[model samples]
Target: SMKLTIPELSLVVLIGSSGSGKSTFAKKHFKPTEVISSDFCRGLMSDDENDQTVTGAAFDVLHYIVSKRLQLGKLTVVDATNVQESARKPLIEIAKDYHCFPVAVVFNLPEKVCQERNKNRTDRQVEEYVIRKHTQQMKKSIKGLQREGFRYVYILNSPEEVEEVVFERQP
Candidate 1:
């Protein structure tokens, strides 16, 4: 297993394709209260997990909550695909305003893994092309997060690296 080191306090964003285990990792390593999920926020806002129509609004609410938590000096883990640069910009802004490091942890699983996993999920049914597009975008962006204002960025390119994620605190 690879070792995931948190060098300092920050907002942690988990980037992955659908069913790339973002929620599972968050549940294993973070308190439910400390993790924000786009799907969960979407459900809370529209009462449906698959409500694509309200995606922008849902993410707005999610980022609003994230901003609130950051202002309160709370550590937060955002569980989302975050595959697009647009989806991540607001969170980076929140971290910047809060003067906290913004760290991105990318789960770069194979496309086959994501497609296979998505087939089993009941709530989300994204087309294979959509998943592939996100994965491609993630691959391109993983190395550029520092340019986008992240203080530290991690790319977990294998299942082994993914399994080794750990949280840390700064005092």
Candidate 2:
């Protein structure tokens, strides 16, 4: 198994497109309470988790919770399609503010794989173009994650790579 070393106190950002298995990875490696999902926040603000209109509000709640967790020296995992620099900058700032390390776990799966997995999901129907756009952005942004203030940037290029990941916490 591939080992991913992370700081004991950190803001772990999961970067990927939808259906990239971000949630699955988080569930496998982190405590349920440690993850702050944008979809779950959206569902809290609105009854529907897929409500795009509440995106801003959802992120606001996510940031607030993450900030709180970091303040308590908790290892917080952000489960979201953070394929954009704008989406990640604030999170980096939050980690800095809380004196916590910032780490990135990138899911760089093939575009076809992402599309196939997304198509199989009955709960949410994301447009083909949307996934394509996110995948493109995710590819472009991988090289710049460290520059964005992440101390460690771990990239999983395939499903097998993702499955082999084992998170190790450093004191």
Candidate 3:
């Protein structure tokens, strides 16, 4: 019911800092069966969502699955805090291979807000250093995602924008 502007079968990449609520947005807009999450993949493979050590392997398998699904012309939402270039680049490749437009939907919430939200999540505690590092990366990468081959980039700068935004299956 949110205002979504996207191609019908595009590969949507949700990017945000930790605690920016990217997962919340994706879950509200995209069907659970259509979402492919890096965290979910890591948890499935390693039984730990925050296990960053095996992220490379987890994403390797995740991208492979996403590629398969995309090739079938399925709409896909990548639910991940893709604040780093390394994490997002491979996803773009997968999107290109499937011939789907890559859409970047960015959650650009303020650092203070994200830090406050991160303080309350039980699944993982955000260290001050990690939060700072992510904030820096998000700020930098968000400015360049469009130049990196994202066909459409939507930046939601506040909680209200995120709440009021819509998700539509474009045909």
Candidate 4:
């Protein structure tokens, strides 16, 4: 088993493209309520998780929820495609505000794996270009997660790595 140590109170940020298994990883490692998902927020606000027009509003709601959980000293996992600086900056700000460490969990699966998984999803239609763009951005931004204020960075380079991970909470 691959063990990952994390602080008791932290804001875990999941980074990857649409089909990078972020949600799956979060579900496997964290409690259901501990995870605040962007798709769920989108569906909550617009009744459609795939609605791109309401992304800003969704993130606003996401941030609000994350801030609340952090205030309560709860370990929160953000399940979103945080493959860009712009997307992750606000989360870092929230972590700072709550005095919690921001942890980065990167799902760096192969491009073909992502494409295949995305193609099988029926709830949303993810464009090929969007996945490609996200993959490229993840590659570029992953190295800078520490510079962006994340105290811990965990990169899972394959599906096997994702499956083998075991979360170990620090006291």
Which pairs clash (backbone N, Cα, C closer than 3 Å) in model 2?
A: none
Q: What is the lDDT for 144 in model 1? A: 81
Cα miss at 156, model 2 (Å)?
A: 0.9
Q: How many clashes does the backbone of model 2 have?
A: 0
Model 4 Cα lDDT, one tens digit per residue, 1-171: 678889999999999999998887888789999999988888888975456889888899999999999999999999999998998999999999999999999988888899999999876758899999999999998789999999999988888888999988984
Indicate the TM-score of model 1. 0.91
lDDT of 2 by residue, 44-162 (tens): 89986556789888899999999999999899999999999999999999999999999999999999999999999977868899899999999999999999999899999889999
Considering only N, C-alpha and C atoms within 3 Å, which residue pairs clash in candidate 4? none
Off by over 4 Å in 1: 122-124
Measured on C-alpha atoms, candidate 4 has an lDDT of: 0.90
Better of 1 and 2 by lDDT: 2
lDDT of 3 by residue, 51-98 (tens): 778977888888887898899999888888888898889889989998
Give per-model TM-scores: 0.91, 0.96, 0.92, 0.95
Q: How would you encode candidate 1's per-residue C-alpha lDDT over 118-153 as one tens digit per residue? A: 889886578888888888888888878889888778
Task: For residue 78, give model 4's deviation from the true position in Å.
Answer: 0.3
* Per-residue error (Å), model 3, residue 13: 0.4
Cα lDDT over the full model 3: 0.85
- By lDDT, the candidates rank as 2, 4, 3, 1
Pairs in clash, predicted candidate 3: 2-166, 3-165, 3-166, 4-166, 4-167, 8-170
- Higher TM-score: candidate 1 or 4? 4
